[PDB]
Amino acid sequence: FKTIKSDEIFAAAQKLMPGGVSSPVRAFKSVGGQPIVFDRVKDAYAWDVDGNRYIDYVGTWGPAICGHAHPEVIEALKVAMEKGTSFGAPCALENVLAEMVNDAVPSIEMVRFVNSGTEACMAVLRIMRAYTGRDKIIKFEGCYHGHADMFLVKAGSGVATLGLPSSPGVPKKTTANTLTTPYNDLEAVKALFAENPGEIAGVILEPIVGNSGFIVPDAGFLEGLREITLEHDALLVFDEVITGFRIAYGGVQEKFGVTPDLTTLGKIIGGGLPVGAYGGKREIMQLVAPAGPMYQAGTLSGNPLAMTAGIKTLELLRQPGTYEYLDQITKRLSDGLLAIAQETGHAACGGQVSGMFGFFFTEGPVHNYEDAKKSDLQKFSRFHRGMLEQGIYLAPSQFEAGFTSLAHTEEDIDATLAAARTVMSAL
Amino acid sequence: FKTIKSDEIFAAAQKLMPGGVSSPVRAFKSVGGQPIVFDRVKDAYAWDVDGNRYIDYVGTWGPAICGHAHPEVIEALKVAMEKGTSFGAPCALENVLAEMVNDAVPSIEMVRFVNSGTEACMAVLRIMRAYTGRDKIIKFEGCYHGHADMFLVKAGSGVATLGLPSSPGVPKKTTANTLTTPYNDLEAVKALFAENPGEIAGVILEPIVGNSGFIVPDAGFLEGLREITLEHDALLVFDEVITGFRIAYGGVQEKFGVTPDLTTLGKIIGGGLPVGAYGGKREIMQLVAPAGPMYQAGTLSGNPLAMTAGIKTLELLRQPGTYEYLDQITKRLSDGLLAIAQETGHAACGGQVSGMFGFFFTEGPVHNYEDAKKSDLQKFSRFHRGMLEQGIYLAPSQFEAGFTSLAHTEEDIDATLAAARTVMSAL
Ligand SMILES: Cc1ncc(COP(=O)(O)O)c(CN)c1O
């Protein structure tokens, strides 16, 4: 297994960019170090600059649900770019994607496109406060909503993997506006409202968690949050940047039947290009400029290429058997992983919903960030590198959910379980 | 002049998105509210959904410096997308663009790519505070640096062309560590330091303003800021999202010979795709994760398509005579505009530097946002519509700088002045 080319490029990168990466998680610091440099991706695979091929379960962190470089998406982009990549003015494509999102997501009646999940989360945070007139927000430990200042509190994703404290650079005054509580803990949420009567703008969370490992909400958790937010006239906000269009066409809110007041979208809606969006009840979205006083702008927002990619991706997701297929192969993958762990004598737990899964090296069960942190990180680090060597590319962190795509074949799953057997038998 | 198709699409849009746009400035609110819907853009032109052709002086707000849909850029993207649009892992292209940016910009020794100017500004703001350990930031009235909550206080850009406030939702407290002063007012800046000893992380500004109309720094202004920030061990941050690679290959810091500690980039570096970046002195950039504790991430950051477009755009800008050409046509355009205004009896002032200009309906001169606000907005609104009717597309706001590109021919400039004469003669 050669990684000479990757080591070379990464070494040079560290002298040009912080940590030699554009995003912290790509770091490999908790997986051993030695990230692999990608050259190209297609369908369910990724190829190294060293020539190594991998069955990819990261899907560029969610966007590639239809498989990498889907021919229809590529074709749509090639035709579209001939008309220019950015206008800086309205175009018909924005209307089309807007309508598609509105029809797809239950809580969304009006939507505003942005360029990332971070921007969408920044905006929704600002809108929640402007609409309610309250400054406090409730978020859960282990959840991640982009790097906006107020979100850098008990955050997951790269924050968790790197084991850093609430990030510095954010003033004390702003941080005081973020109340945290353990995921799946309704009682802790009620206490926060009781201790801050009339100050909570609302509750934001990943309806299904992917940033502190894969975590599904307990029975009644989402329902409870909906109930109490309504009780105190606070907003319930679903960050479906990862779950949107992956858990179901309408995301978690649709599958689990709980309608929030606002939801953030990203990843999949961009089809592989930078795209984010936030929407919800019409009367709340009315506050967004230029319709309302809440100024939020974006030069590249709604650019024709991004809209094109998003539109084609959603159209492909509307075809027959899409989500059934995702659940079929992912359930077999997840079940197989757990069966193998047990057979090879390693404590483990996990689960999956549609094309989203998780696998932790701990007996669990895992209901929150604390439980997930019981995972044997050193064993995970060995497992990950071993899988890499067997041709399987997993997220380089125990605290990141894995993803499958429509391009993953039954054969790909077979090969992945075979690799898992080989690696875990040697762990 | 028919705009039937535009009115139709825009009317439908207002029922799907806030104000029917993805960004405030696009609703034409300060200029009558009848925006034109774009279908395509090429070279120095834009085409309506109604079939109308315009000589474009917005250039999608800065990115299109080499002309719209430049054939070499399109070709580079078509070749690149065959390998996938997003990896979610390191790629050789990031190193190439990183090196190019480092070599091009004086203050940048290390750089981190993001997906918009807003993300870059959010990050640099956090970095300034994390590095110095101070929470207060000084910004100028009329300047704009994204919608980073901690910034909605004297914000510029659209904030002027739509009677915007401190964009609600941003706790009056979050924006409590942000101090403002008039642009070009060194005395006001010294006073702020004196009134907040040891609390100022630094000073951030557009080295040349484009968001409160076009405004150049007075003699000694940039130099003074550098001097005083050094005096109080504070950072000097240049927001060159607009000016970067437009005012000069090395931006304003290079052309005017003043080196900041940090600078944000955007627009042009993306070649039309969503791209942003922040960099500066190596020791400061060292704090960015995963190299340091300051957290900042982005799923689409450093994606292949974005890097590809940025690389090709900067390569085109390194060809012989690029900036000389921009200055040549833009000086004639700007001078012509002023000459015509005088000949037609209308008080005006403006100016240009490279391919960036401004034209205000006020005698001026304009040294800051206050002066710019003396512009006759009603006259500007009539001028803009009249120009539209003559086939000229200008920024739909008196407080937005205009831009030219390498694709604008001498003939395009001639036709633009001819149009200006016709419109102003009838004003
Ligand atoms: C749930 C969630 N929300 C928001 C974000 C931020 O996304 P982006 O990189 O698009 O800013 C992330 C990280 N992808 C996320 O996992």
Ligand SMILES: Cc1ncc(COP(=O)(O)O)c(CN)c1O
């Ligand atoms: C000087 C400046 N800084 C930051 C930004 C934010 O740019 P973006 O839309 O790319 O976030 C802009 C664009 N208005 C800008 O002109």
